[PDB]
Amino acid sequence: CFPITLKFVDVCYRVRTILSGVTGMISPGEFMAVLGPSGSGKSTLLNAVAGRLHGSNLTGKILINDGKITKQTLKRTGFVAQDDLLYPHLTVRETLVFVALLRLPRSLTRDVKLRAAESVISELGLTKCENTVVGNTFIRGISGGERKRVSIAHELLINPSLLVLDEPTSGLDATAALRLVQTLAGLAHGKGKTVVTSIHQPSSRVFQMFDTVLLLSEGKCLFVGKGRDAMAYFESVGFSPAFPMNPADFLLDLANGVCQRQTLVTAYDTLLAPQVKTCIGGITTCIATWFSQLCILLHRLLKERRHESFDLLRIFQVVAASILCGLMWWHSDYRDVHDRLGLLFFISIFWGVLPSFNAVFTFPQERAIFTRERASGMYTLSSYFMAHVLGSLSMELVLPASFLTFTYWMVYLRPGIVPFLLTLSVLLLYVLASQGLGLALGAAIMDAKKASTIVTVTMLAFVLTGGYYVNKVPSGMVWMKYVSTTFYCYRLLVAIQYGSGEEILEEEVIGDVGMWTSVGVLFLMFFGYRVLAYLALRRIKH
Amino acid sequence: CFPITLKFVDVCYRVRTILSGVTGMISPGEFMAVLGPSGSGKSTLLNAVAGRLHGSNLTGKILINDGKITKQTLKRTGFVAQDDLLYPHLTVRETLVFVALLRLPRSLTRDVKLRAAESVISELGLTKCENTVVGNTFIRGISGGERKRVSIAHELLINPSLLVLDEPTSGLDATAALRLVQTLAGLAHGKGKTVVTSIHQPSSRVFQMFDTVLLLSEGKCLFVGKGRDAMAYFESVGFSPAFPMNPADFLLDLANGVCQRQTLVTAYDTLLAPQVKTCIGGITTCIATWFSQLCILLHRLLKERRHESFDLLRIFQVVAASILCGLMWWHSDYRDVHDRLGLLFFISIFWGVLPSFNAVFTFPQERAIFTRERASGMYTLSSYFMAHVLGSLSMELVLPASFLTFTYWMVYLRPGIVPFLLTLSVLLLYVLASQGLGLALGAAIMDAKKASTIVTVTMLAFVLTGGYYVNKVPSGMVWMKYVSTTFYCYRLLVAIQYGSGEEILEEEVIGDVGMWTSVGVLFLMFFGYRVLAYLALRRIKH
């Protein structure tokens, strides 16, 4: 009930000039294709007419519906990008319901907000595959011609009226590239939209689906016409095919100089180009809509935190370490101290290296998805950060709580329920204070290979200064132990099992720092590493 | 000076039947294309006519030059496969010289064996790019249209006369797919070869380069003719295009039933198919040619072992560990034993975990290249295995020999040159006996992710039983220490630094196993892990 008339009369985009003099207008109900050679600037004319390149070095009068490009007339414009950014473990129906709860406004009820994710299922051909998982090339899911049809459905929830795609039929085979163009011509004809696209190398019966074409040979345009008379035009200039050929291949051969392009630029500006020119509170509301954004993001990512934590090779490493501790220290005796202290220091190494090494892969693997979803009005950074914080400290407390229950009663540590719940609490605090070091380095580096070798050097300096290997620290590096997390875990485990002398009586048992000082620093390192992981994600200003 | 006439009259290939009734003959000097839909069995007719599918379920009379397919008439047949398997760090000229020394026979001199790798450089268009490295999508090297032109040059060194390619112009852009077909039509015309290929979706002026075509729609063939009269044939049956279209797109549309295929199969067998039927010592020699194969393989892989060992993130981890050992134990004193024993056990952990973790990535990353090169008469397994054994024990002795020289003289171990060359020898033997555990597990599993978690569990059981953490092993797992490599390294380092009492006098200093028993087991584990790594590569029978 509201059409749209795109009209651009612009001039060059100097980075060399990518575009130089292009022009043309698009009416409602008109499926248009923009085709040229590779590296000719057809990915820039689309990207600058949806409103994503402006200001610095782009001058022109790209005007939308006899007006001006505005934030008001930009919510009704969907730019389907070239690559697909989806979560693998979600199903196709769960993908489009979680997106529908974030894109659509909050004034609507939750009965039409998931009804409008149901008609988009049937408007495209996504009805047979609404229960299989999406997957990737690791997880066997939907086909490649349907992942593109989901990404088009991501942009049709907001009901746009100018849909600008960017090479849709690239990578698709011969019969899904035809069927995807057939349903895009149904949107422009049967619904009234203004679909604009750029096909790389169209086949012959894909070129019969177009209503308006546009050539681009390194800047300047050669033909802006209806498309059925693209061959009747070029024979008036003196060009014709010498053998039966695809019409989209002849006029794409004319663009890069191959004759059978100096006289094509000149004849356009004198015969065809001066013809289209003639047609020219907010207090208690912003709190409750913050927690509404957080409850949706904990349910999207719940299947992703479960695959990341409960991997079948991370279970085998904990099962294999829980039997070796239970067999080398089987039925230990408490009055030989040098063995009991080596049990309590292996636990501090093992649960400081595993939560901290696997946490550097969280943010580099999702920085391409996040920066697309953020600049679409779905969520800010403070609610995407607090869904990885709260979603990881609920799933990472399952394997160390099962390591210790199986081990504590075979290796014969202190009996009773009160020295067991103190050993469980110090261990689970040391797990949470140790993956914050992984989140702080993985978000300040943004490379999973350069940050996996700095977190290894960092946890090497925390082990050697933990107080077990070297006893006489050489008077210049005594400060090095007060910043290591392994030092504060190991001196708490010994204080629970032995206390302060009086029953074992070598003053490795008697500590030097304290009992409450060691737990007040592991909370300072728990909150202090999630702040420095947020200030490094704020630093990437888009 | 020896042409070849391929002639196949075969019947079905039942795995459902992929092929069912195809036939046809190819003359010398005739560039032929085999085109059909995806999943129609055009990758099987090529793969079975070069001589790579036979015996079990393939029956027919595929005969070469009025004869029979034989090992004699199979050296002159080059099957250029679909994917490219090249080493990245070699240049294009060094790639084709190392292959020319292996493919060509040994009776020739080494003046024409690299002259025949020089004319193949100029016969293809590989003259401008004969000095840039090959690379991959990690290392910036040659373009994608030239990596295919190197893989064609890999097969033209032996000078074939029947060149069978398999989708060459797949992934290439619009103007390198044309230029690659133009030089393949020059081999069939200007040299006299018999080029057979299968193009996926040819453009219009690529289809003008063909001399003979063949359609395949799920088994049976529809047209075997000259190609220029493929449109004059189908109008005699009653099919014609309704709009101007690529001729390779009309008759590929007829294959999968789309009309504008029941009457096409019937009309072929009655009108066109009964027309092509009417035309129907060794003792001292095998030693010296083993070492000649080994000297070529150490020079191919020398740039690959250098990138695998001297990576700039593996240098930083050794530099960062050599300063922490030199600063925590700076100017150590020899008469406090509990600190000196913790220096000697960290060294045993650090150089047992690093050579053994990085050795499991050697054989899984090169099993696709090796099984193609082996079944081409280039090398056997015993000379490919002894080039990874001898090429890795020369490059892995550089970082631990520089760790110990910087560390031994700051941490103040025993003075003199004779206790230093004993500490260097025990360490370098423990490095070589530890990567054999990586080569044994990485060649018995053939997966870099499943074998990286078993080598971590294995080196966890070797640390806890090494004799440092637990002193009183609980009487049932005392056997577990005699198979760990860390136990035999750590008890040798202590025996060099302290001897057997008499100057420090706690019997952790006095050993229990011996001085020569501990070095005779580290040679048994040095030779015993390269045998079990060869018997697991012999197990993959092609």
Ligand SMILES: CC1=CC(=O)CC(C)(C)[C@@]1(O)/C=C/C(C)=C\C(=O)O
């Ligand atoms: C050998 C190994 C494999 C694992 O399972 C993880 C772990 C961290 C425990 C370890 O790296 C052990 C390291 C040890 C014991 C000490 C150290 O660092 O000085």
